[PDB]
Each structure stands twice: as structure tokens, then as C-alpha cells.
Amino acid sequence: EEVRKGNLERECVEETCSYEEAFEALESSTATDVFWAKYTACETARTPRDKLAACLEGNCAEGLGTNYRGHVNITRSGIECQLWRSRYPHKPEINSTTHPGADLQENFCRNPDSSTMGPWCYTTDPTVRRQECSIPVCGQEQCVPDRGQQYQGRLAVTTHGLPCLAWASAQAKALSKHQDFNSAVQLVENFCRNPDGDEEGVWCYVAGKPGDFGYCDLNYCEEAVEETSEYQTFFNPRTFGSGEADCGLRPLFEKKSLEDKTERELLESYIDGRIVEGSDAEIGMSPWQVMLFRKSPQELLCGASLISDRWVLTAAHCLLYPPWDKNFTENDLLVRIGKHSRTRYERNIEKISMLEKIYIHPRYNWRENLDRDIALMKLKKPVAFSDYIHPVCLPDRETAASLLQAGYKGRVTGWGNLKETWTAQPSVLQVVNLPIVERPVCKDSTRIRITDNMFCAGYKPDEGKRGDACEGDSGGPFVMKSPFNNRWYQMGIVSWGEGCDRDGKYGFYTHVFRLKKWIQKVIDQFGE
Numbered sequence: 001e002e003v004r005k006g007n008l009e010r011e012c013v014e015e016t017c018s019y020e021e022a023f024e025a026l027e028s029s030t031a032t033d034v035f036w037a038k039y040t041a042c043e044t045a046r047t048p049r050d051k052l053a054a055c056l057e058g059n060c061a062e063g064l065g066t067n068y069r070g071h072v073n074i075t076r077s078g079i080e081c082q083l084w085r086s087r088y089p090h091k092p093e094i095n096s097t098t099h100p101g102a103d104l105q106e107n108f109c110r111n112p113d114s115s116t117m118g119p120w121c122y123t124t125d126p127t128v129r130r131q132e133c134s135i136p137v138c139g140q141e142q143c144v145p146d147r148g149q150q151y152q153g154r155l156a157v158t159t160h161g162l163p164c165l166a167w168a169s170a171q172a173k174a175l176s177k178h179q180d181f182n183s184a185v186q187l188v189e190n191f192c193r194n195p196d197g198d199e200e201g202v203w204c205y206v207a208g209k210p211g212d213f214g215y216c217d218l219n220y221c222e223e224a225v226e227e228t229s230e231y232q233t234f235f236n237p238r239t240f241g242s243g244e245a246d247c248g249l250r251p252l253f254e255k256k257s258l259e260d261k262t263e264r265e266l267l268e269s270y271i272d273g274r275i276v277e278g279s280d281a282e283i284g285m286s287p288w289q290v291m292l293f294r295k296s297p298q299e300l301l302c303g304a305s306l307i308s309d310r311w312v313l314t315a316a317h318c319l320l321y322p323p324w325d326k327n328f329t330e331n332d333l334l335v336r337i338g339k340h341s342r343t344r345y346e347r348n349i350e351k352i353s354m355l356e357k358i359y360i361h362p363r364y365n366w367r368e369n370l371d372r373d374i375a376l377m378k379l380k381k382p383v384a385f386s387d388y389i390h391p392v393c394l395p396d397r398e399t400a401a402s403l404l405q406a407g408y409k410g411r412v413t414g415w416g417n418l419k420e421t422w423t424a425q426p427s428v429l430q431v432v433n434l435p436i437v438e439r440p441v442c443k444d445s446t447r448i449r450i451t452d453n454m455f456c457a458g459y460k461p462d463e464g465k466r467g468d469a470c471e472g473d474s475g476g477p478f479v480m481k482s483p484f485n486n487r488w489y490q491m492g493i494v495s496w497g498e499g500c501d502r503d504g505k506y507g508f509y510t511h512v513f514r515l516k517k518w519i520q521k522v523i524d525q526f527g528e
């Protein structure tokens, strides 16, 4: 009757025990002492039972982490743990015999010396001896970290309920090592893994043409990102197209050692008193700006943002919105670039270009809050830049915060195309600057809830201010100017603030810094 064994459940955890008692009826002595090792670690978590119960079984950090008996390979950063068995790169001061208390098996993080920093391991990185690991703390359940860079679980389907493809799958290996990853990531079967340091999160492949990749739904911990010039080329020119080397350097201004009328105003904290309305932009002030027209009828549809000589952004809901019947093929549309009069045709200033292919961010969802309201379009032929056409620089995690702190305000350049899908009207491009508003103040002014993916902007209303919410085009650029490398970076892709109607308040724009890698897979998908 081993099934019995005066079970502890009642003797040692449903109430405490603290030894002997783990004696009368209990054999295999050192196992009574490996239990005791566990039990001394769980010490301070004696009440309630479930806490202790879940401490002893150890996928769980209590206090200084000694109790951990789970299976995590990786450190805080991404470094793989050097097996405890091992001396390369590091001869251990603490081998399995010297501290036989802790379970020093394989490379799973432990804490046999109970260092204040908690569970840790030896590194495969020769410059780093021991780096602590980030482990599920007891009673703060779920919360994936590092955008699923250290994801060692088993998720095998996309957000849209599609099947992941195997990571060899004949062609899924043919295109794998086409690009470099982090090899400290175990790419099993068909599970959702984040090789390429994707700021968006984990993902996998899907049935379709080569390189099809839905993303994976996982509860990531809330990254509250809101805490000639030298800007290195992230992209691969051949696929992405040229431009990045020189992006965000306005021909008529930056290159000509010129500040426009309202840019110096951006520096200041809202000098308690001075707002500036949406006047007309002067020429070459928002060159990356784009206009999306329907072909037949000649119907202006949406704003956009040049990022190269090749790729351009917009708001997914400009081509796909089933609440209407928006489903535009490439043959339905065209874009215009470097325009200034909405109505006139700019002869030998503006370029007309057609579409080659459209790419709706795979995690686009309109059936709730327009999550990932993002799209991507390639032009059937590249575009030649000028003093009127010029691309905007794209930011990363690091620049977000850097620019959302030091820089206080941003900028919405448009022909008010968002507003005017509602009334029935600016004739010429309007520029206007808006301060980013604290997220919590933005939260309790709106019903539709805000992920970390979206943010708010505008001046504070005080009972006598009418809502200038809805400045700019829909799918157009919100932009910011770095006071360090002196380049224009796009932060937002204008979306419907509420709709726009409801407002006597603030203005909404989707984040972009997490796109970076999603883009890189798409330009490859299409090709060179």
C-alpha cells in the first residue's frame, strides 16, 4: 500500500510538519533528505497550502529561488546556460558534489549559494560567468517575457486559428537559414518560435506561397515603452530598396541647414499658454507623405507614408474593412506622392505610381478595436526621389521612449482625410504638432481599450477647448524629430479616434517600432 504512505499532503502541507514525522513510515533515506532540501527552501511559504504545494513542485520562484526544479535553459538576455556538468567556458566553483543540495542537472537555472539575485546559470558566453534567469514567480501566473524570445513552450497555431508548418517541411528548411537568427532558441517540430529577435513576438509558417507566416497569440508582459547624419542600415537594400541610408533628411530643410517655421516650437514643453493650429505646410516639409486614390471612380481613399523607393505603409482598414465592403485588389488602386494641392495635379512635382502587391499585417483584427491597423504596398516600378519626394526613417524599441521622453511633441501632416469621411475641408497640406499624452490620462477618457500597441496624443481639454481630435489623413504619418541624429522618424499610423465623432478629447495612432522584422520577412517573401 504505497498509494497510501501516510501522505504528507495532510501531514506535511495541508498543515506544516518540519521532519521527524517524515520518518514513521518513510524509506529511501536520502530521498527523505532531497524532500527536506526542497522543504527547507519553501520554508517562508508555509501558509496557505496551495502556495507551499506549488512551491515544492518547483516551476516557481520563491524568495531567493533555491526551490526551483523546473527546466529553463536561458538567461535574462538570451545567452544559453552552460551545462553544470561543464567547464567550457567556465570551470565552476560549485560542482554537483560540492553543493549536492540543489538540483544541478543539465543547464537549468538554480541557486545553490542563494545569491540575492536569485536563480542563475553559467554562460555559453566566455565574457559572462553567471547571468541570472527570469523565472515565473509564484502567484503572478502567465506573463511571457522578452517578446517570446525565451519561449520554450508548445504553441502550434496562429491568432487566426491556422496550423503552423514544420520547421523543416521540405521548403521550410529551404528558406530557414536564408537569414541569421539566435541559435540559443530550440526550433522544435512546428511550434511557435522567435528566432530573429522579432520585437512583435513569436510566430511560425503557414500554408500558401513560400514564406507565409501568421503570428502566435501569447500573453507577453506589458512593455510600457513610454517610460551627414549617422543612422545604420537595418534593411537589405536589394529587397527593401534604397533610401534608408539617407531617410528622414528633408531635401529642402535638413540638407539646406534650414529649420521650418514650427519645428523649433516642438522642443519646448507646452509653454503653458501657446497652442498652434493646423495651418498650411510649406513645401518639402512632409515629403514621404502619400495619397491613396481609387482608380475608377477617381476617389481619394487614404493617407500613407513613403519608407523607401519601393515600400509604403498605410492603415489596413483603407483596403480591408468588412463592416463596409472594402476589399481592394492591386488593380483597384494607385498612389500619388509629393503632392501639395489636394485637387490640382502637380505637373512634374508629383509622381503617380501603381501597386504590385498588398500585404495586410496578419494579426490585423477589426472585429474589436482595429488591432494592428497596418498594411504594406509595393510599387510596380520604383520611385525617383527629389526635393519633393523623400522617405521617412523607421524607429526601433530603443528610439521609442528616447523620443517619447526628450521630445515632448510630434506632428500630423495631412489633408484632413480622416475627418472628412464623415462631414460630407483643407485644400492644401496642413501641418500640426500635438503633445503625447500620459497613457493613464488617455485610458480613462475612452471606452475602446488601449493595448501597448496603440497610443494617444493632443492638447488637454478644460471645458472651453473644442476637440481638434482627428487631425490628419487616415493611414498617414505621425512623426517625430530626433534631437540627436537629426532625422524624422514615423511613430504612428493614424486610426479612427473613437470613430472621430464622439470626441471632445484626444487623438489615436498605432505604434510602428515593433514592425521592423515583420517587414523584413515580407520584402523577402515578395523577393528582391
Ligand SMILES: *[C@@H]1O[C@H](CO)[C@@H](O[C@@H]2O[C@H](CO)[C@@H](O)[C@H](O)[C@H]2NC(C)=O)[C@H](O)[C@H]1NC(C)=O
Binding pocket: 073, 083, 106, 107, 108, 152, 186, 187
Ligand atoms: C534546452 O532546451 C531544450 C529544448 O527543450 C532541451 O532539449 C530537449 O530535451 C528533451 C528531453 O530532455 C527532448 O524531448 C527535446 O527533443 C530536446 N530538444 C532539443 C535537443 O532541441 C535541452 O535539454 C535544454 N538544454 C540543456 C543543455 O539542458
Ligand SMILES: *[C@@H]1O[C@H](CO)[C@@H](O)[C@H](O)[C@H]1NC(C)=O
Binding pocket: 093, 095, 096, 097, 098
Ligand atoms: C569540485 O570542485 C572542487 C574544487 O574545490 C574539488 O574539490 C572537487 O574535486 C571537484 N569535484 C568535481 C566532481 O568536479
Ligand SMILES: *[C@@H]1O[C@H](CO)[C@@H](O)[C@H](O)[C@H]1NC(C)=O
Binding pocket: 320, 327, 328
Ligand atoms: C477580395 O476578393 C477576391 C475575389 O475577387 C479574393 O481575393 C478575396 O476573397 C478578397 N480579399 C480578401 C483579403 O478577403
Ligand SMILES: [Mg+2]
Binding pocket: 014
Ligand atoms: Mg487538500
Ligand SMILES: [Mg+2]
Binding pocket: 011, 021
Ligand atoms: Mg504523524
Ligand SMILES: [Mg+2]
Binding pocket: 020, 021, 024
Ligand atoms: Mg514521531
Ligand SMILES: [Mg+2]
Binding pocket: 021, 024
Ligand atoms: Mg508522530
